[PDB]
Write a protein that binds this DNA or RNA. Sequence first.
RNA 1: GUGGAGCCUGCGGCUUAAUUUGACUCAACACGGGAAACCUCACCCGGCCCGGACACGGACAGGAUUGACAGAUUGAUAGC
Lengths: 120, 117, 68, 55, 100, 96
Amino acid sequence: FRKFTYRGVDLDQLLDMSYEQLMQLYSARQRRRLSRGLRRKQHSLLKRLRKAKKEAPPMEKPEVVKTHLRDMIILPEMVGSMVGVYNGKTFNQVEIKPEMIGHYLGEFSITYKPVKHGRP
Amino acid sequence: VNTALQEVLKTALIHDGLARGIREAAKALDKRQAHLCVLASNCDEPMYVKLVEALCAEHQINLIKVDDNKKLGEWVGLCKIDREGKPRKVVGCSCVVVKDYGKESQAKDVIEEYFKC
Amino acid sequence: KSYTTPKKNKHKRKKVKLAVLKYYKVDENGKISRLRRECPSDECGAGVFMASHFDRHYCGKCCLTYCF
Amino acid sequence: GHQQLYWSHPRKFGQGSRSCRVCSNRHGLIRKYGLNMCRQCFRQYAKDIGFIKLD
Amino acid sequence: HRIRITLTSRNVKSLEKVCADLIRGAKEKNLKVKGPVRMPTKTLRITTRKTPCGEGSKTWDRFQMRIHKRLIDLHSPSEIVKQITSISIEPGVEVEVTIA
Amino acid sequence: MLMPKKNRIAIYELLFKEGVMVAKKDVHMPKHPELADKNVPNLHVMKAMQSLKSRGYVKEQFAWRHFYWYLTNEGIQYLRDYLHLPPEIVPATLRR
RNA sequence: GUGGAGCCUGCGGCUUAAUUUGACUCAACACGGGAAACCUCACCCGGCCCGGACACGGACAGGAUUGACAGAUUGAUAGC
Ligand SMILES: [Mg+2]
Ligand SMILES: [Mg+2]
Ligand SMILES: [Mg+2]
Ligand SMILES: [Mg+2]
Ligand SMILES: [Mg+2]
Ligand SMILES: [Mg+2]
Ligand SMILES: [Zn+2]
Ligand SMILES: [Zn+2]
């Protein structure tokens, strides 16, 4: 009904919040992973995400930008943009709403194919 | 003295002085590293030959004007392969710009004297 | 085996016979006037031309661009 | 260009990163004292290196 | 005066035959010499598998490698010690003479 | 194999100045070890040297991870013919 | 003790783009020094590239053609 709230924080407080401060906010590995940093491969993601939001219509998902980093935390910088996460074979299309922060993009394209035992 | 000019050009090749192709020649003329330039003629180059001629006339560039391109290429002797015989199929070169570290030679001096005459 | 894509072609480089000819500008008098910018580098004090793109300048052997 | 591609994967650690200068293999690298060799080349070269069956 | 020799080697009989020869040479030239101080020799330990593949038996070595140190201290000028030291050494032995 | 013309002439000069040559068989080398003053990555020396071999100029031997090349008199004479040097001067292995 | 039990590892079966491929008493089954995330790696999946040497063709120093700063679907600052 309302705006979301992490511990004492609203999403708007999350969005207009610095990264290291946001680190202290969310979880140890995740705050650490921001403290450690994004490489080239992840930066091209951020720019290509901005261009997709520029080209995107209002009532439409932004265009997909692919990244193989399945091992990658979806940050609020990233929020509101499509990213094609690589499985190895294919790129899975993910729109990243604000609750996605602190999760992997790899999460949304499962590596093992989920099991069904009695198939034949 | 074409045999002497051939020996001088070969010694310049030995010492690695010569700065060649029209473009590197234009560079060497601009840098003012040309002591003599030579240009091919009797070739459909109405603008090219006119440009390089005015470029040499611009500031302190001596100009030899050899006739054929195939002949200039066989003289300079770039892709001489199968030296036990003739060069198999010369491709015609247009321009050569000599830069001369090894100026101390009797053939070079006799050329400077011929130019004096 | 049948391919989806046609094979890709090698980039045919836009060859011009005596391309250096269009670099300098001819005159009935004995001169040359290097119009477009000249590089201030020591290897080409002046003569060598820069690329003239539709939008902004650029230099070839050393690879350098200047946007609008 | 190719210079930013040719060898761009990071080789910082592990028997995968370093390798035997004999095999180029990543199996049994003797890393102590910087011997840097696989159990097979070690077994092969122990006498030359000076190791000995005392006990 | 105080020159300090450090004799190391992989093989033992070479080390003792060389160090004993140089000390005997020192006794001949007559100057204060400390006996060869046998430091305790160390032992480098390695355990490898014979097998090419995974599948034969899983066999293991118990590789030792001893490394022996003698050391000799003399109280004498430098040139005479250079005279004794140049002569009477053999391949296995490694001599390192600290000057002070 | 993209050489710089500078390397073609300096590498032929290297082959001349030391008649023989050794090199590690290692593709994954930023710089060559024995000859580290120039960059000349081992892949460059390797691929040039295998090209020389292909045209008979070097004798091959392979140990551990490391090629070993003996330069023959045809190689000595070809290098001096390319560089137009006199017959007086020589490599250090030829010189005495 | 182990065996019954929860679990470590290795193995079968299945599925899978690929699960490179080997072995089933001893003499397969924490074996491949197999503690493999990528790498390994082979296998597979998109796309480049040739690291197709050397010889000879062509080609051509009136520049063969690599490298190459732009913008475009791209992991990427691949002139792919
Ligand atoms: Mg149990
Ligand atoms: Mg059980
Ligand atoms: Mg095991
Ligand atoms: Mg394994
Ligand atoms: Mg692991
Ligand atoms: Mg693979
Ligand atoms: Zn420039
Ligand atoms: Zn081995």
